[PDB]
Design a protein around this ligand. Structure first.
Ligand code: LMT
Ligand code: LMT
Ligand code: CA
Ligand code: CA
Ligand code: MG
Ligand code: MG
Ligand code: MG
Ligand code: MG
Ligand code: MG
Ligand code: MG
Ligand code: MG
Ligand code: MG
Ligand code: MG
Lengths: 698, 700
């Protein structure tokens, strides 16, 4: 049967490739040229990024093999290739799918055209899911079972003298690869995306607002795809992989931590069989999630498309989530029934214990999404207050947006607090990680619905460059914008969950062979009364704020570089100038996110790094929530004024447009980069704590 | 004996502040037309003060009743004592400031020079500074004497069990009540006064001020309300909190270090050493107040203003350094058990911590300056970005604040690390005390600031000579820069004091059953506990929500004043704002006060510790960001107005972008930041107190 679960990744990959081929079959003369224009620009950006990322990955794998065991470097390469493949597939799928849906809208008059766009987005969603789970299964087989990485499950010592559970180190390397690709995609692509929006909206004003023949306008469509299709997909992939890797690390290290030396011999209080089963269970959970998501997507694409698009995708999400719930019910119920010693791990239900954590994480993600919706949409009270206040002043608009974000911080944080508390009550930290996984159990469906958004935005833009077709694409673009906001909120929540699980794995990875005799209370400890920890937390929070602030100036500078530049059309592909600049400009923030654990870890030690991690996680969650919600609220409040639904080209509209020019880079670059900051720093620290746990120079 | 010459320092400061008040009152006011407007501001400020005092004393009565019911009466008495001390300091400073602007302006005209008028302005600010210092040290010395020695609360130093059954060391509980009173008065002053101040600023603008706008008078009153009363009370609170943290740490380190070795319970740290450590921070603060008075005396005697005030600060600070040197070397030379407390250098060890705080505060101050003034690169870049667009100005301001967080935070981190290395958590608290040792001088310069601002408004009131206006106008800009530095110093010291208070919270978490437990096990807040992590997330969310509510409250109060001004066709508009502001402060204050209680009784003490740490982190970061962003926006607007930018003058499009960004920055820098400082510190105090009751009483 496990051979029939291993088949789910290949099934998903083949089904996504088939969806790609079928949309290639979908029909697209003047309109087709622009789609070719955008596809070529996206391919140039992807090539530049891929070259840079693979050079960096070569260096990363070399360092990993030199300073740790080599299998971790090999797994890093595997995961990086998986993520790059998913991103490239989705973007290539979409660049040629943007116009196809428009041709579907005219030929099908609304209704059938949406089926094409969703079959497109499903390509990227299933690609993310299948590639991630494929990399993980290959790591568990080739390294886990083939090489006997689960057979040992004892502290292996590197040739230089580094101690670690080998399979935990390998899964950590895989998570690191995913994190590197996700960081490059989102940080660099977001810098480029908001530089393109800023350059387009400024060039319209430079010499008309969003001109169609503006090169930066084409770049902006490309950036929407780079951000919410490729970048967001990679971010969700990273969070999901991180949750799974945290679960696996926790199990592997609960193997050595729960031992008792009554005499010379050492008796494992948790048998190796239990540790193996706990290492394997999250993978089975993710595979079940992928299966349920594919079933839901199949029912959605096949059945008679209703007029209301949002209800269809919402029902797809509900199907995936609740089906995964009910099925992993049995998986959790039987798989963990035979394990021995689960009361020591903290399981309040034995076999089904973690399933509760998973489901509560699912509902947590759902609720946080709903919260983001409530605070960022014109259909609810807060955005309406901002839109109506637009008459009061421009400074009033900015202050009200900042206050709205600050207030919105609370509800989702309370949701996450309750989810964490109940997941802990159920199954300890392993269950907290399992709850994060459950939240991201249907990561494939989430990524697909998120990719849908940019395609709809591109369809509306295509209408802007038939009256019924233009209006229908505009409505599709608005629904896509709402879905993208919901996706950003869900991604932030899952990122907080993954970063917390990775901090837990970091504390668990800090186990040492000398601590074997010590009780569990001594090893799994990061005291907050130690001055080193407090200083580390302050430093991590300040670094998170510094990263978020730097992203704003980077977007502005890249946009200014695009402004400096610029057969009547001939060939204009300025994107590289911005993209290359973005790839250079994102260099410094990345150096922070990766190198902060090492220096402070080698300067002060592992306890200081834990404080840096917790402070960074907290500050990043808060700042990301604030920035994302502020940007989304400014955008849709401006949309409300555009329709004039209540309360165009006026003074209030000027205040709103300035607030949106500020919010775009904040919600589409800073926010989306902060979660990556927290999670990748957690991963890098989890890995390097093996080296600077005892190697601290002060 | 000899301590009786330190016991006199608070009364000395109080008498000297009264003497400064009398000597300034002797000074003439000059022209009558300006004096009339000054009288109007005095009446408005007094009405606001009366409303505030009535509300705050009602709330303090309720608080003291509950405290005495659930704890020892000595704690309620000390709470009322501290509240009265802070209220007296605030009222005295406010009267001095409201009545001191006209003296400086008329002195500028009479002596045709800035020097002589500045002597009056500094004698004014010194009233508030010395009032803060003297009242604080007086309350603390009275608590150390009447309760500490007379009843033997420093004699016993053992766990007393209340009638309801709550356990605690008595003197720690008493000092905590004192800190609670100070915190309540500071919350009222800063939260309410900031809401009103920025509502009046928003009403004023909703070439500097409108003609006879009622909000013009309101804004003149609010400038005094903020940097004289509010900022002074905040610095006083941080300084008192550092001292109380040191004292609590000593009181609880007495019982925590016990060993049943030797065939009987042996206190590892002798009671004499614990007594000396309880007394040392008080004497250090008294020495600091003395040095501050000496420095201010040297400054006022002799006939560029900033260099003079900077020299006052340096004199006070370095004199405290060199004097607490011998204080530390002799007082603690005979102490026993410092190796258990963590002193790696014995007697003078903690003295280093003190200086490490002092030099850190200075550095942190300078850091604020660097990021918030147009005389340095960041504000210049913002002013130049004024040309590209308004949204660019807003984005660049936000980015500047987010980046500015780092330098001062790194300073604080290194200071904390070195203070720990020197003398443990006790030394961290001692360093907070040293940083705020010259609180009188800091508060004095901070009060000087708006004395100068409204005096410049006073000079521009009526009409006045352009040459005369320039001399008074120059005083106002120096005040603005110094006030930005003071806000930075206050935020940094508040973070440091709140950290010391969290350490005191963990030490207060000691229980008689935990007496047998090892020292490492009792003083522990694991960050891997899900309760703790959830508490941190909740605290950060609460901090952000608090800041957002403060923004909305400022806007609502400004709208109320605008609507009342529409009705007009005196002091009625000020009262309306005061009422609205006090009602608005009900909700955030209730958050800050009841969050520890609810979270502790629902979940427990570890969740409360997590809430505290998360709130401290988020509040420090948000306060730094808001204060620096607002100040930098203001100075960049000045850069464009000053003509440093060429081609663009007042009323230009770049200036429009800069002024809009400044209207956004104002409420953030004058309300959100200072109220965040108050929030973090008061939540630390409330948790430190209530952990005695909900340590084991958590219902979920
Ligand atoms: C179910 C998967 C089986 C393979 C089918 C894959 C086709 C669907 C993916 C389309 C997107 C990529 O576009 C595809 O890229 C790869 C090269 O990189 C090339 O495709 C070829 O190489 C790949 C990899 O060696 C093989 O799967 C296959 O022999 C062939 O499809 C083609 O140039 C192009 O069809
Ligand atoms: C067992 C027999 C089969 C063994 C086959 C192994 C072959 C491995 C050598 C592959 C060499 C090609 O290496 C290629 O590099 C470029 C990046 O520069 C990537 O190529 C990918 O991105 C680039 C830039 O967008 C585009 O050409 C294209 O979209 C895509 O093919 C792929 O990573 C890889 O296809
Ligand atoms: Ca927008
Ligand atoms: Ca100002
Ligand atoms: Mg836009
Ligand atoms: Mg547009
Ligand atoms: Mg977009
Ligand atoms: Mg668009
Ligand atoms: Mg567009
Ligand atoms: Mg103003
Ligand atoms: Mg003004
Ligand atoms: Mg004013
Ligand atoms: Mg003012």
């Amino acid at each position: 049967v496990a051979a029939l679960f291993f088949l789910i990744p290949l099934v998903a990959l083949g089904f996504a490739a088939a969806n790609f081929a079928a949309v290639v079959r979908k029909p697209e003369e003047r309109m087709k040229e622009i789609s070719s224009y955008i596809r070529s620009g996206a391919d140039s950006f992807l090539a530049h990024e891929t070259k840079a990322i693979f050079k960096v990955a070569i260096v990363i794998a070399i360092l990993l093999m030199i300073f740790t065991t080599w299998q971790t470097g090999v797994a890093f390469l595997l995961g990086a290739v998986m993520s790059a493949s998913a991103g490239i597939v989705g973007m290539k799928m979409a660049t040629r799918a943007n116009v196809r849906v428009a041709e579907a809208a005219r030929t099908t008059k609304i209704g059938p055209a949406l089926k094409v766009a969703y079959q497109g987005g499903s390509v990227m969603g299933l690609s993310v899911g299948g590639f991630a789970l494929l990399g993980l299964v290959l790591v568990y087989l080739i390294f886990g079972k083939w090489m006997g990485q689960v057979d040992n499950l004892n502290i292996y010592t590197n040739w230089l003298g580094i101690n670690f559970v080998p399979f935990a180190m390998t899964v950590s390397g895989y998570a690191l690869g995913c994190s590197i690709i996700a960081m490059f995609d989102r940080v660099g692509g977001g810098v480029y995306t908001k530089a393109a929006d800023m350059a387009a909206d400024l060039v319209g004003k430079t010499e008309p607002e969003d001109d169609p023949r503006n090169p930066a306008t084409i770049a902006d469509n490309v950036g929407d795809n780079v951000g919410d299709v490729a970048g967001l997909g990679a971010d969700l992939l990273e969070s999901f992989v991180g949750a799974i890797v945290s679960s696996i690390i926790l199990a592997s290290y609960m193997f050595p931590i729960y031992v008792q030396k009554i005499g010379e011999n050492l008796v494992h209080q948790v048998p190796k069989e239990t540790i193996q089963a706990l290492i394997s269970y999250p993978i089975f959970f993710a595979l079940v999630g992928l299966g349920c998501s594919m079933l839901g997507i199949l029912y959605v694409i096949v059945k008679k498309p209703s007029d209301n698009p949002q209800r269809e995708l919402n029902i797809s999400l509900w199907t995936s989530a609740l089906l995964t719930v009910v099925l992993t019910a049995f998986l959790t119920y039987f798989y963990l029934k035979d394990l021995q010693g689960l009361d020591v791990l903290g399981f309040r239900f034995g076999a089904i214990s973690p399933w509760f954590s998973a489901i509560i994480g699912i509902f947590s993600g759902i609720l946080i999404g709903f919260w983001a919706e409530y605070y960022t949409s014109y259909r609810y009270k807060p955005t309406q207050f901002l839109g109506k206040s637009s008459i009061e002043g421009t400074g009033m608009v900015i202050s009200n947006g900042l206050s709205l974000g600050m207030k919105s911080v609370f509800p989702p944080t309370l949701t996450l607090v309750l989810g964490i508390l109940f997941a802990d009550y159920f199954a300890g930290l392993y269950g907290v990680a399992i709850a994060a996984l459950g939240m991201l159990s249907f990561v494939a469906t989430s990524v697909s619905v998120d990719s849908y958004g940019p395609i709809a935005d591109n369809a509306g833009g295509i209408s802007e460059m038939d009256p019924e077709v233009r209006k229908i694409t505009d409505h599709l673009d608005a629904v896509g914008n709402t879905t993208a906001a919901i996706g950003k909120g869900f991604a932030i929540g899952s990122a907080i969950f993954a970063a917390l699980s990775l901090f837990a794995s970091y504390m668990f990875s800090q186990i040492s062979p000398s601590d074997i005799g010590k009780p569990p209370s001594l090893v799994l400890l990061l005291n907050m009364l130690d001055a080193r920890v407090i200083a580390g937390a302050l430093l991590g929070a300040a670094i998170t704020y510094y990263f978020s602030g730097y992203l704003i100036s980077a977007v502005t500078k890249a946009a200014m570089k695009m402004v400096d530049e610029i057969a009547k059309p001939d060939y204009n592909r300025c994107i590289e100038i911005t993209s290359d600049n973005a790839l250079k400009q994102m260099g410094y923030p990345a150096f922070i996110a990766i190198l902060t654990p090492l220096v402070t870890g080698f300067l002060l030690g592992a306890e200081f790094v834990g404080g840096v991690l917790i402070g960074t996680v907290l500050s990043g969650a808060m700042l990301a929530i604030l920035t994302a919600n502020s940007g989304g609220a400014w955008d849709n409040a401006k949309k409300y004024l555009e329709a004039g639904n209540l309360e165009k080209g006026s003074e209030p509209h000027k205040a709103l447009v300035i607030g949106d020019t500020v919010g775009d880079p904040l919600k589409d670059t800073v926010g989306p980069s902060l979660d990556i900051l927290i999670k990748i720093m957690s991963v890098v620290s989890v890995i390097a704590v093996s080296i600077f746990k005892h190697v601290h120079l002060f």
